Amino acid sequence: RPYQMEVAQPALDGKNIIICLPTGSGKTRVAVYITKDHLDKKKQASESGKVIVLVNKVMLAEQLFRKEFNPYLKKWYRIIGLSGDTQLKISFPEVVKSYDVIISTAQILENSLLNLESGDDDGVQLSDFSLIIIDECHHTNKEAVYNNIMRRYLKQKLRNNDLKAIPLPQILGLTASPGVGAAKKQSEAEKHILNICANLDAFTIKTVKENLGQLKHQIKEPCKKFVIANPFKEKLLEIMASIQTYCQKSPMSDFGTQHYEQWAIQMEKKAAKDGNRKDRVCAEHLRKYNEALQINDTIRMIDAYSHLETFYTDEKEKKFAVLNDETDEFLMNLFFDNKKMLKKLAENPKEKLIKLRNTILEQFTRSSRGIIFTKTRQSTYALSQWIMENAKVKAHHLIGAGHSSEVKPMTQTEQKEVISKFRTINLLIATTVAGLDIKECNIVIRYGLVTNEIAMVQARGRARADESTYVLVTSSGVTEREIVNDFREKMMYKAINRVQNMKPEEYAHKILELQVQSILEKKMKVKRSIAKQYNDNPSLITLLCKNCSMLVCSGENIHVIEKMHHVNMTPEFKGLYIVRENKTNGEIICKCGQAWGTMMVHKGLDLPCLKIRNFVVNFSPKKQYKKWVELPIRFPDLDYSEYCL
RNA sequence: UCCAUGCGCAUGACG
RNA sequence: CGUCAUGCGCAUGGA
Ligand SMILES: [Zn+2]
Fold this sequence. Notes:
CATH superfamily of the largest domain: P-loop containing nucleotide triphosphate hydrolases
Largest sheet: 4 strands, antiparallel
Bound molecules: zinc ion
Number of strands: 18
Domain Helicase C-terminal: 352-510
CATH architecture of the largest domain: 3-Layer(aba) Sandwich
Domain RLR CTR: 531-645
Strand order of the largest sheet: 14-15-16-17
Oligomer: monomer
Keywords: Antiviral defense, ATP-binding, Cytoplasm, Helicase, Hydrolase, Immunity, Innate immunity, Isopeptide bond, Metal-binding, Mitochondrion, Nucleotide-binding, Nucleus, Phosphoprotein, Repeat, RNA-binding, Ubl conjugation, Zinc
Family: Belongs to the helicase family. RLR subfamily.
Strand content: 5-15%
Helix content: 40-55%
Distance between the termini: 74 Å
CATH class of the largest domain: Alpha Beta
Number of helices: 20
């Protein structure tokens, strides 16, 4: 392509660069062009032609292995589409020793490199290659993993320069808008761009200026648009005030925010440091009440009632299964005295939801397509069920994959499923997952959201088909945030055009400085990291429960499996804990009712594994970490010769 | 295909 | 530095 021609042109001979273009301009295709010409150059030179294409995500890897690299190189060259989940019969160093072209994923590579410079399995170095290709360069700032790679590259380049010579590979680099970082200033942005380049050790950026018109003919752009707009709550607030007085809790802030939550968690910390009740227990309950609040700010109040209903339901189930004090008695009765009545209040009408329904219905009377963003998963589920109740345009939710923070997440397969159904669902409900292959779209809304400029442009790329209906529902400073996204998009060109028109000498000087700076930063960080974990004590401690400061385990009685998990056999421990299971790894609970861990099935054994998240330490410098890795002191791996017979 | 777990990473808001 | 929310990758064991 013509616009692609010049931007590719320098890379054809040396010229480790960056490229940045907008959505839809087929950057994969030009990348293929550079590949084929490079490999043909190596056939002309009879040199080791190798390309080790990198990404951040598996799905783009599979996508390109289907659609882009094979259909243009299926004949000439060897290709393979790699991942961490796709079980490959062979290790990585062989697909280095074969398969001249590689689609891949990042941390596979770094793992092989570590195995190189740390023993185990046959390693690999960068010197085996002649070229590297990247997508989404903008992640190359804050030691994100595909930046260890270039720090190694920079280390070896400076070894070459102190020599000045073992060779090193050409380095392409692609991206959308390259992102700007922590800026209200042009100088900071410029410095950021230079940090990015020197983390890639590139030469220029080389964007498109000549043929912007033939390209503009392709990209129909969206229209930047804004479309913007008790008593049940107050009863709950009065309950909260009652509880504050009940245990002398000083908020130092208002109800319905994050600050209140933060102070509650700090009370939980202090009271575990004390081992005292009525203090952290209230922190937990008020954390729950504040959840209910700041969903009530945005969600139908029935959903908060259901949230806390299931909560206290589980609480009663815990305590009864335990039995099968005044504090929990007060709290439970305080809830259940108002439970049914608040259920009654929840049905009453009287919002963001109302303007929202209005906009939505008006578009679907205008138009077919539908996209929704927001912050959280529970919001997606709740609004999905709610619109399923409200008289309608079928719908479906979407969320990510992490098994974190409340929910049973979804599946990659099922994500693909729902996306194809949308290629048929009318309106999707998603968290920040949806920069992906969803085009020909109208009404990407932002219901109670914030995003950054790069997320903004990735959302732009998804709304197409000659119809943009950017909508925003948060007012009754968020309009500020689209305005600053525009401002940053202006600033980025303002800085790129300043650095393109820059001397090569001073350019090289600044980039060398930033390279040395980042390398020394990594070195000092590794120093402090090695200094970090040095204790490795067998048994120095006693693990106690956190509601009740009762002894639970000792320092030596613990053992390790899978070099991941911890366990306490020695059924003197078994005199303590209680089991539960409802809906196949059953859960443990306390002699009070605290939840502790899981009965993990391992090699026939029902080992009781516990999570440090729900226990407290006594070396009494009481401490708490939430993660074993925080704790330097080491425990042994298990020897089954104990359990025999 | 599903389950559970550990680890690292970035983003945004907040202090 | 911590908190929250969100998203991503890798490595495990099992069905
Ligand atoms: Zn207890």
